[PDB]
Amino acid sequence: GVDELDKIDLSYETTESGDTAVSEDSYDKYASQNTNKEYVCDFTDQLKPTESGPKVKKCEVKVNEPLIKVKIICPLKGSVEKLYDNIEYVPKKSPYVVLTKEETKLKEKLLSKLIYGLLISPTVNEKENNFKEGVIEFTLPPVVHKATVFYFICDNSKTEDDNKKGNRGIVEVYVEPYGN
């Protein structure tokens, strides 16, 4: 489909674990902070370099009701000296571009071609809706016909302080059908 050949990288491939070598049964899995209609995944304090690193921090966002708004916060490099120097986020074009599992690897997909009727506002408060500024947002539509799963990454595992290593953030947005 055209418009996809112009916005996504068809050659991109990654995995949930990345280069951490941690299997999913050893992830630190936890649920998003859900308040009213807003489900939030905040990695502000989850990814700092630790002795045991690299760890995988997976935030699970489970949606089965309409008009839910998802906010994801990924600390910027420089926010705290030394701790996020090598932090990276994927896709760079989030939330317009997301990762979906094709076969057994994560590849790029346009979120608007995945959850139709989605709303992505260009701004988050006064900021740009992009991990470049530290936070992304999108609002799911009143109706979803099919189960959908897509991922975001906020990886500080390549950052090293002392002998400590940062953790790898993962967001899984599991949108079960709703609205009939």
Partner: single-chain antibody
């Protein structure tokens, strides 16, 4: 070592113009949106304008729409605010404030501008003796607090607002655990435990308003430590 330094302030005749500038240090300027907030003498905080990292999206308050223009040069770590057709109502300290995950997290000392020849609701006063747990409340509408997290500022007179609570209940590094914030529906409040004389100051709540497309502040509450 993040610092924001304004300049250009001074005395302007009613109807004149003035160019404010703010120069940034200590952080990647290209990764941060910027704001201008103004405080008239004796009054509270009023958001003026915002500009995104890439200058792709500018936003203004209707107080200043048509007269004010925000710009930035990231090669010069520069933020700018041209102010035209000024009025006595525009008399205020003009802070440049870096945008945070919630409300703006770092502020400059402010440029004094003198021109001479929808809101959050806070209690006007709050008081308590040392050691007590005092409460300051904040209420709004569904366009702001009904769909956006609250933030809390502490301003000692003569200095810039200091961020205490962002994103409802998060504390910036260096803020004691005795400060905590809660929020429910269109209501919110700030809790200050172990109250001490060092807390005697004004406190503002802040949240985004989707209808206004800008930051809204509370009128402010003066906390006196008895």
């Amino acid at each position: 070592e993040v610092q924001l330094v304004e300049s250009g302030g001074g005395l302007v005749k009613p109807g004149g113009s003035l160019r404010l500038s703010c120069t940034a240090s200590g952080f990647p300027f290209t990764s941060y949106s910027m704001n201008w907030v103004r405080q008239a003498p004796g009054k509270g905080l009023e958001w003026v304008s915002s500009i995104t990292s890439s200058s792709a999206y500018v936003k203004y308050a209707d107080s200043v729409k048509g007269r004010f223009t925000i710009s930035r040069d990231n090669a010069k770590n520069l933020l700018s605010l041209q102010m035209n057709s000024l009025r006595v109502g525009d008399t205020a300290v003009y802070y440049c404030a870096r945008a945070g995950v919630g409300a703006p997290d770092y502020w400059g000392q402010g440029a004094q501008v003198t021109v001479s020849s929808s809101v959050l609701t806070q209690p006007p006063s709050a008081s308590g003796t040392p050691g007590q747990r005092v409460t300051i409340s904040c209420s709004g509408r569904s366009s702001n607090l009904g769909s956006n997290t609250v933030n809390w500022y502490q301003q000692v007179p003569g200095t810039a607002p200091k961020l205490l609570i962002y994103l409802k209940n998060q504390r910036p590094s260096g803020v004691p655990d005795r400060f905590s914030g809660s929020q429910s529906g269109t209501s919110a409040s700030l809790a200050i435990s172990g109250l001490q004389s060092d807390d005697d100051a004004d406190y503002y709540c802040a949240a985004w308003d989707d209808n206004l497309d800008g930051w809204v502040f509370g009128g402010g509450t003066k906390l006196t430590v008895l």
